[PDB]
Amino acid sequence: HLPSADWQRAALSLWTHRTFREVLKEEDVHLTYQDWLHLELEIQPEADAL
Amino acid sequence: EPHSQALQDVEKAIMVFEHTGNIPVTVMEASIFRRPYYVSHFLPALLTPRVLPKVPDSRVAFIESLKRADKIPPSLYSTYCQACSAEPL
Amino acid sequence: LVFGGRTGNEDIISRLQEMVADLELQQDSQEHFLFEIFRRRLQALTSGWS
Amino acid sequence: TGNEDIISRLQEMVADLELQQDLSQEHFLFEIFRRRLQALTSGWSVAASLQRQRELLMYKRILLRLPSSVLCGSSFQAEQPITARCEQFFHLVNSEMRNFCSHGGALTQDITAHFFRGLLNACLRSRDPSLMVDFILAKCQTKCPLILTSALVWWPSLEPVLL
């Protein structure tokens, strides 16, 4: 779909990588529903990407 | 006449593709069994010999979907790319 | 180059979401005007293979 | 300009909770409203007055978006179980909105119509509709006289829709 396949690959390699999963557990970092809401409110219906 | 009509046809194919994804299929049919009208249609689909933006956009991604569909014999695509590079008073 | 399809308005599609739920509650056997409208437009189009 | 997908997700879940209750009880919204009004400065400072005006126009907005069923419930079951959530709304309109979202000893075209829509909806869906409407609008001579003083101004608007 979207911009450079290398950026895509980079994201997927990071997402699969173990030490990112082991970081995501002890978490303030686990994206609260309210945090998610703040970022989804940040974005506009103008420039979407989807 | 089959230039202005073919343009109105591919316009619609694309604005529909957009609210969808994955290739408005009326056109995919017209491809294999209307080969003459396919080429008279597919030429206004390659009519982007213009400012190609920084960001790939509607036409761009539609043409991308076609070339991934293994349509677009490469002659016409290569030509498309090249053209785009561009007293009395 | 017609170059895709601008959007313009979903504001108006959320003013519609109003009056749908309004008329729905006010009714609650008889059927909707939607499908009448749908049939009129599908009919008023060409029946061609063009 | 940011929000108008998420305010549609809100419509989704408000109508859900309307149906689950329709299967007497009062809405959580009015408690959230009272909590934020409470947690503001009671200070009379122009800063605080503007901040509360801001927050009440935002409340008026979210109520216009969401169904008029949140105000008057739906299907008033009898005279005994009556004025549930309407008293909730009346405290809000007396306490706060009459300060801010008003004009001229009166309310707004918008919220007046939003109210009268929900009112006639639940009343007509219920039995003895003319008598129950007469009942709630006699209550309003005592509890929220604004809605009437508003309905005097915005009658030309409502009368068509009501009729």
UniProtKB/Swiss-Prot annotation, chain D:
Phosphorylation is required for the formation of the nuclear complex. Not phosphorylated in cells derived from groups A, B, C, E, F, G, and H. It is found in: Nucleus; Cytoplasm. DNA repair protein that may operate in a postreplication repair or a cell cycle checkpoint function. May be involved in interstrand DNA cross-link repair and in the maintenance of normal chromosome stability. Belongs to the multisubunit FA complex composed of FANCA, FANCB, FANCC, FANCE, FANCF, FANCG, FANCL/PHF9 and FANCM. The complex is not found in FA patients. In complex with FANCF, FANCG and FANCL, but not with FANCC, nor FANCE, interacts with HES1; this interaction may be essential for the stability and nuclear localization of FA core complex proteins. The complex with FANCC and FANCG may also include EIF2AK2 and HSP70. Interacts with FAAP20/C1orf86; interaction is direct. It is linked to Fanconi anemia, complementation group A: A disorder affecting all bone marrow elements and resulting in anemia, leukopenia and thrombopenia. It is associated with cardiac, renal and limb malformations, dermal pigmentary changes, and a predisposition to the development of malignancies. At the cellular level it is associated with hypersensitivity to DNA-damaging agents, chromosomal instability (increased chromosome breakage) and defective DNA repair. This is Fanconi anemia group A protein. It comes from Homo sapiens (Human). The gene is FANCA. The chain holds residues 1012 to 1182 of 1455 of the full protein.
